[PDB]
Amino acid sequence: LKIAAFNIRTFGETKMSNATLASYIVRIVRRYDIVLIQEVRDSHLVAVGKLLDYLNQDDPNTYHYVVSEPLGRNSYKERYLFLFRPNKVSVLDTYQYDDGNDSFSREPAVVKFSSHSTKVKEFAIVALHSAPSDAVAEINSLYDVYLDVQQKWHLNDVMLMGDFNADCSYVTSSQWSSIRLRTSSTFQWLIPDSADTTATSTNCAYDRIVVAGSLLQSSVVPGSAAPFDFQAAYGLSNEMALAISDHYPVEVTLT
């Protein structure tokens, strides 16, 4: 089972209407059994529908979706979009964290999957694209989101993932001690602080995959979690690379 989280810079109609860029996004999505797409700026779901048209052109059930409404504190809004292959996994349940805009600018989408191909049978994925200027507080808050999932679904097997902005000027070395999601031994951080998850010339581990729960942690293929450098993978110029996104997907495989 391959799972990814991918911030696609200004994912929307203009980008999906570009045949070249659309093809690259489709190629990347197709790598995964579950993928979380962030920075969806798609007022009428038109770009989401176009992506699904391409993905499902041959077999109409290649991918199914879970999508949020537009989220944000002000006029700038983004959706979370999960795409998944229904033959690999099934969505059992979904919700939007609300305890919401008090704790997150984009309230996390939470999806429960069942998964018969892997050691873990049911697990949740929590999505977050944090506000960079609030990254410490928002990542620390995911600890409370975790407790919520536990309480709601009596479930300890939870993956938290997305563009957490978790490095560089947004989270410095001394600030990790302020983040319960990092300080708690409950969580394994699969994308290390050393990784580069930006397609641009910065060297930042902004994008992250965190796992909680015995079974889930044991399903992870050790060493499989990493950024997917699509510029290298596809032999792209840096300019073509950045036209796709300023971030790489971060991925992980379950066995």
Add this chain to the structure above:
Amino acid sequence: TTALVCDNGSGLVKAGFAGDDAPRAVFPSIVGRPRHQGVMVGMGQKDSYVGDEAQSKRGILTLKYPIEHGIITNWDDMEKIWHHTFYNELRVAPEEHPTLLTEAPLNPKANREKMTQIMFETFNVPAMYVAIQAVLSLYASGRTTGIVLDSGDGVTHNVPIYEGYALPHAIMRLDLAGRDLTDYLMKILTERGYSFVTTAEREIVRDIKEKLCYVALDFENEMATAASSSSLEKSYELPDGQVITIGNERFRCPETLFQPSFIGMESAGIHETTYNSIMKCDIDIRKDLYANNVMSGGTTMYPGIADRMQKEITALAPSTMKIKIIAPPERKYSVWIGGSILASLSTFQQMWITKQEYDEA
């Protein structure tokens, strides 16, 4: 016991309670079903969306318009629209309310019978009535004789009415109305150098149409005025905050009603179809039709339109004929208002078809 009034159009449903002065619910006449399998976060799989939610989620839907040129053509989707109207928009139980529905000029009898069957058998309404849209608009203006120009999102009709009787031999239909004007505005703004094509850009163009367009009294003089000065330019601030300027597009767009050739249609304009309709009527009622031209419908809302109609009909009519165009400020809803007045009359209460009558017939 309060009657409901539902005025179903090609583009918009206008629905509400009889005796109210405006419809409570106005929303697009659209049903959309998802093209792919998935859910909105925290929701179950939906079979379809109706109205505003269908428009705002349209990118992952296939949209259907159950009403075409004012006539109901998809009964399954029309049922969904009515269900949404009763349960979601008005939040009433339909078996508790007599219901007035409206229909287009020249609606086939079989269509009216199907509307009636669905209301009684599917929705279990206790009574109902079907009225002709143009007759309701006339009634709302306080007249029983006159000629109605009704122009909405999908169709424009001229309907002469004599002592409350719409004369079907003289009704004219023009398949050009608001949706065509919006598309033409999009086209000519695009020719100017702007870029308006997406779903969202069409939404903005519809707004520009409704806020800045107007009908020139003398189109060729207005074109010359627009060329010689900036006096007819108007600014419009887009959602993102950038301001654009629109000039002769403001009056070229609704000019299409008088010159359908602007969108490649070979048809007479609305002034000509008005005249032609009056000329199909007995000469002895024409004086009364010319003095009582009532405009109805969203697409008659353009500033200038009444003056330009008065001018063009004066040019066609006998030179001593008294010509009057009546264009009520609330005329985008005047069909619905006429229905609201009628359904709220104690006088009217014996015109309802009851379920008992429907059971006996």
